[PDB]
Amino acid sequence: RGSMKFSFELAVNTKKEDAWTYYSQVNQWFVWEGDLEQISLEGEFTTGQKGKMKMEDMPELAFTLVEVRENQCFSDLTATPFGNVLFEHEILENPDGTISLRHSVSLTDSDTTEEALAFLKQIFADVPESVGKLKQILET
Amino acid sequence: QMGRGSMKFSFELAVNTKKEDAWTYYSQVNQWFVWEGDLEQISLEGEFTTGQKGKMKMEDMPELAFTLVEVRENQCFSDLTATPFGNVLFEHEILENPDGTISLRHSVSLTDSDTTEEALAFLKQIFADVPESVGKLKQILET
C-alpha cells in the first residue's frame, strides 16, 4: 500500500442500535459532525449511495457510502487533492457491556508525502471531539 | 482490552518490508534510538519477553519505569507506564498485508472514567509525535 491511517477509539455506555441512529440518519450528523453546514443523500443509507456535504467556510463535497453494515459500521469516500480519503466509523462491542466507537481517516495511497501526513493530521484533528460528542449524547 | 472509560489513538502505516526485520527494531531496546526521537536512555532488566521491566528517559523528562505486558514475535509488543492519569498502554503491531507489504500500527490508550479534557489532552500529547516515529521506522526499513 501507500496507506496511512489514524484511528480514535472511545468506549461509551450505550447500545449499538442507538449509536446506529446517529450514523444512518444523515440529518442528525449535525449533532456530532463539528462544523457541518449542510448534508444530503441521494437515497437510502446503503452501500454505494452518493451524497453531498458541506462544512462551514468550505466548498461542498461529494461523497460515496463505501461499506454500510447496519449496527456495525459505515464508511464514506471523498475525493481530495491527495486522492480519495476514506472515513470509517465502527461500533465495537466490548466484553464489559459497553460499546466502543472507532472513527478512522486514511489516505488510500501516497508515498509518505510530508504534506500527505500533514493533511490527514488536520482532518483527524477534529475526530476525537466528534466521538466525544456522540458519547455524551448516547449516555444521556 | 478496551472497556468503560478507555480511549485510544492509533496510527498505522504500510511499509514495504518483512516482519522479521521490523521486529529487530522492537525487540532490541538499544535500537529504540532510531525511532524514538526524544530518547536519551533506555534499559530492560533482561530478555525481551512478556513481564520484563525496564527504564527509559526522554529529553527534558525524568526517567520512567515501564513493563512489557505482551510480547509476540514477530507480531506485536506492548508496554505499560504509570502516569498522573493511571496507566498508559503503548501498543506496537506488525500486520501482514495481502499485497505482501506490511503495516506498522502504534497505539496509546488510557482509562478515565470521567472522560475529562485533561485525560484527553494528555493522551493526545503522547500520541503527537507517534506518526513521525512510525515514519522513521518506515524510512529505515525501506533501504
Numbering used by the authors:
A (entry chain A): -2 to 137
B (entry chain B): -5 to 137
What does the study report here?
One such case is SMU.440 (GeneID: 1029579), which is composed of 138 residues. SMU.440 is a hypothetical protein without any known functions or protein family classification. The crystal structure reveals a fold similar to known polyketide cyclases even though the amino acid sequences are quite different. SMU.440 also shares a similar binding pocket composed primarily of residues with aromatic and acidic side-chains, which points to a potential binding of a polyketide-like molecule.
In addition, five residues from the N-terminal His6-tag were also observed in the structure. The structure belongs to the SCOP superfamily of Bet v1-like proteins. Prediction of assemblies by the PISA server indicates that this dimer interface is the largest (interface area 946.6 Å2) with a favorable interaction energy (ΔiG −6.9 kcal/mol), in agreement with the dimer state in solution observed during the gel filtration chromatography experiment. A large forked cavity is formed as the β-barrel wraps around the long C-terminal α3-helix. The cavity is comprised of Trp26, Trp29, Glu30, Asp32, Met50, Met52, Met55, Phe60, Phe71, Asp73, Thr75, Thr77, Val82, Phe84, His86, His100, Val102, Phe116, Ile120, Asp123, Val124 and Ser127, most of which are quite conserved residues among the SMU.440 homologs. In the bottom of the pocket are primarily aromatic residues; whereas at the top of the pocket, close to the cavity opening, the residues can be divided into two parts, one side with mainly acidic and the other with neutral residues.
